[PDB]
């Protein structure tokens, strides 16, 4: 049943830099306590995102930050938060609020904020699913200053207390790209409607989907969207090759890359490795298929796909960063989620629809002046997207071996592969598919996924399609890759002449002509036989540019505003009094009644009395005494 039960978990990662249409620490001037906390943490120099963002946040401007995971966005918005709050407030009502996608991300934010505010009297609360709604009631009674929450639970508690958020002045959206991918849009909009207009809005993300751009335009007051510069210029130290590959030879071509074009050692390796190969794919089914195929071939491979378990992703990523696995296969969304260290080797299995997505996946490497390699497998159907990539990068295309020494780093050089081994590899793939049934089932699943992904993938441009047809007609599509060698160029050419002049044959008559059908074919042939600078550069205006609905926790459809009253019943349960209205001093007796446990939070909390002792049972008196102890504890 649950094969494609809902949808391919990694859908797409759409990015819009047209969203650009929005518009030391001591030298930055932080408080002494915050400075000592940062010194304890070890943030000697702020990361580039911090350096560009924190001054703006201190200048009280709403900002959207394009930054990779692990760039330090968490501290980037927590340090200004602590600097702004700087003390616990005796007036009831919180003013710091952050919305995070998942509980793990929320806990990471909790750890960051605690370590960055050790000593300061700020009260920070976590509000995520799986915890007791009563416990969250008690924490709101403790009256925190900072709220770190997941939006669904946030609305649940919002509806349950009818809380007043007018005191909130500081609002942060962490990983809003994940928020919108998981589908938090409507409830986020209702949160925004609840929030007072007089607030400072921070939004940290790695990508800017058009939905997120519209949300920012709707909810942000003059956003000074930010970004870096490694998110534009493909590091010139990146050297790229493109391989014309066939559908049935795709896996064989991927291993020739690994074997003869990369010299990838087999077995467990004896901080990434010297090789450091990442593989970017189209869906999780390709992820599993390629991972298992590589593992059978003998390659130390870790796989990370979209809807993978948290612990599993953690283990695989930790192995890749420690160098226990040298190949890492990711789709797009898992890649964006995981913090990828410096890489030397990038392989694009399925071509990306967006040249900007290609730019991200290749800026994954060739960093800090260290040279990087990018090999991309392209098919005839993906050739228009390759040409769109050409237009985006403004580089020249070299097809096959039109130039003797093409510069693969600055030129987009496309070629085929060593026919000899390519075939010895494709035969191996066919053999393993015929032998291992699990691999065959996986291959069929990825075939269906390929069909679905081709159906749902965004289209190319008309000019790209036309010139793709022209390239396919041209000779440059079918010869070797410049890398191989001029001697190969010699030997390939020794017979390529006759081979090509055989491939380019126009039959005089079909085997059917060799009846009414024969007459129809002859008429068909007769019908469809072949058909018989000067400008001023200074001023030449050119053409190209230079009851509302929300989903509940149970998943069953639930109305937007449904006050179950169980908060009032909570009040009745624990005989409490009226909650402190916004502004009134925190009530220490209620704080002591419901403040917090003694530290570590266990989960295993059932105290059940044992069954009544039986005389015929062996441990009669012992069971009787434990039952007596249980009734004494009550």
């Amino acid at each position: 049943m649950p094969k494609r039960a809902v949808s391919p978990a990694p859908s797409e990662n759409e990015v819009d830099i047209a969203g650009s249409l929005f518009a030391g620490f001591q030298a930055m001037g932080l408080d002494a306590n915050l400075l000592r906390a940062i010194a304890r943490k070890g943030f000697s120099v702020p990361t580039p995102i911090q350096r560009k963002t924190i001054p703006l946040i201190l200048e009280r401007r709403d900002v959207v930050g394009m930054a990779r995971t692990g760039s330090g966005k968490t501290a980037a918005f927590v340090i200004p938060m602590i600097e702004r709050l700087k003390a616990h407030s005796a007036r009831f009502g919180a003013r710091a609020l952050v919305l995070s996608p998942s509980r793990e991300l929320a806990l990471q934010t909790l750890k960051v904020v605690k370590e960055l505010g050790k000593g300061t009297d700020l009260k920070t609360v976590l509000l995520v699913g799986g915890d007791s709604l009563e416990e969250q009631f008690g924490l709101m009674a403790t009256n925190p200053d900072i709220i770190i929450a997941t939006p669904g639970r946030f609305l649940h508690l919002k509806v349950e207390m009818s809380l007043d958020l007018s005191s909130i002045k500081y609002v942060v959206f962490d990983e809003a790209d994940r928020l919108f991918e998981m589908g938090f849009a409507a409830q986020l909009t209702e949160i925004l409607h609840a929030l007072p207009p007089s607030r400072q809005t921070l939004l940290f993300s790695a990508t800017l989907p058009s939905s997120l751009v519209e949300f920012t335009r709707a909810g942000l007051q003059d956003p000074v969207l930010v970004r870096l510069d490694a998110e534009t210029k493909v590091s010139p130290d990146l050297e790229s090759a493109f391989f014309s590959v066939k559908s049935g030879e795709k896996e064989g071509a991927l291993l020739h890359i690994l074997y003869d074009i990369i010299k990838m050692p087999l077995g467990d390796p004896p901080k990434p490795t010297e090789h450091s190969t990442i593989i970017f794919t189209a869906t999780k089914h390709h992820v599993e298929y390629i991972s298992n195929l590589l593992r059978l071939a003998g390659f130390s491979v870790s796989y990370v796909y979209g809807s993978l378990d948290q612990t599993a992703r953690k283990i695989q990523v930790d192995n890749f960063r420690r160098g226990r696995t040298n190949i890492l296969v990711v789709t797009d969304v898992a890649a964006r989620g995981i913090d990828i260290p410096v890489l030397a080797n990038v392989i694009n299995y399925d071509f990306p629809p967006q040249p900007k997505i290609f730019v991200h996946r290749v800026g994954r490497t060739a960093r800090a002046g260290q040279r990087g390699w990018a090999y991309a497998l392209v098919r005839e159907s993906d050739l228009p997207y390759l040409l769109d990539l050409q237009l985006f990068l403004g580089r020249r295309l070299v097809l096959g071996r039109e130039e003797k020494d093409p510069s693969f780093a600055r030129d987009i050089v496309v070629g085929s592969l060593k026919r000899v081994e390519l075939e010895n590899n494709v035969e191996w793939v066919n053999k393993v598919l015929h032998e291992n049934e699990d691999i065959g089932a996986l291959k069929r699943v990825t075939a269906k996924a390929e069909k679905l992904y081709m159906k749902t993938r965004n289209p190319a441009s008309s000019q790209s399609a036309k010139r793709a047809r022209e390239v396919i007609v041209s000779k440059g599509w079918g010869q070797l890759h410049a890398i191989f060698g001029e001697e190969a160029a010699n030997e390939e050419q020794v017979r390529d002449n006759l081979l090509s002049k055989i491939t380019g044959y126009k039959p005089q008559e079909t085997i059917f002509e060799i009846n009414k059908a024969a007459e129809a074919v002859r008429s068909f042939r007769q019908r469809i036989g072949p058909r018989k600078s000067f400008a001023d550069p200074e001023v030449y205006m050119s053409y190209t540019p230079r009851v509302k609905m929300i989903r509940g926790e149970s998943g069953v459809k639930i109305a937007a505003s449904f006050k179950s009253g169980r908060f009032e019943k909570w009040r009745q349960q624990h005989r409490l009094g009226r909650l402190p209205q916004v502004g009134e001093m925190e009530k220490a007796n209620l704080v002591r009644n419901f403040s917090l446990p003694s530290g570590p939070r266990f989960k295993h909390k059932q105290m059940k009395a044992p069954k009544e002792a039986d005389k015929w049972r062996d441990d009669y008196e012992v069971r009787k005494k434990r039952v007596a102890e249980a009734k004494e504890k009550r």
């Binding site: 049943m1 649950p2 094969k3 993978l308 378990d309 612990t311 049934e437």
Partner: protein, 135 residues
Amino acid sequence: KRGAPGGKLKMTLGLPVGAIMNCADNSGARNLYIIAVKGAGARLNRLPAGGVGDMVMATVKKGKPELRKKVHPAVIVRQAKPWKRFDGVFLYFEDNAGVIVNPKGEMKGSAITGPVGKEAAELWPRIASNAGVVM
């Protein structure tokens, strides 16, 4: 080919759709979750169920994280719901347990923890090979 066993006699089915199960092999999963039964007949609101030796489709709920949240065929080897064998013997097991098996009938693991049902051992020759206790 649908994994419906042939020659299976009537016995009481006590493991309906959506049923939590122990995992008896060394494959890396601890529990399974029956969602569908092979060879079942859709009646009005009738929940399909399977007895010892019947192939089902199960999803792992706990175990090795790499295999977690994955769906595999399985065949059940131990059933706590009592049923009668043709020698007139009504019997039941301590828990509910099965083993992950490919659609042809081969096990992913290499050993079975605990006894194996006689019906499953007779229907699937591989389980008879990977079984140490047969009752």
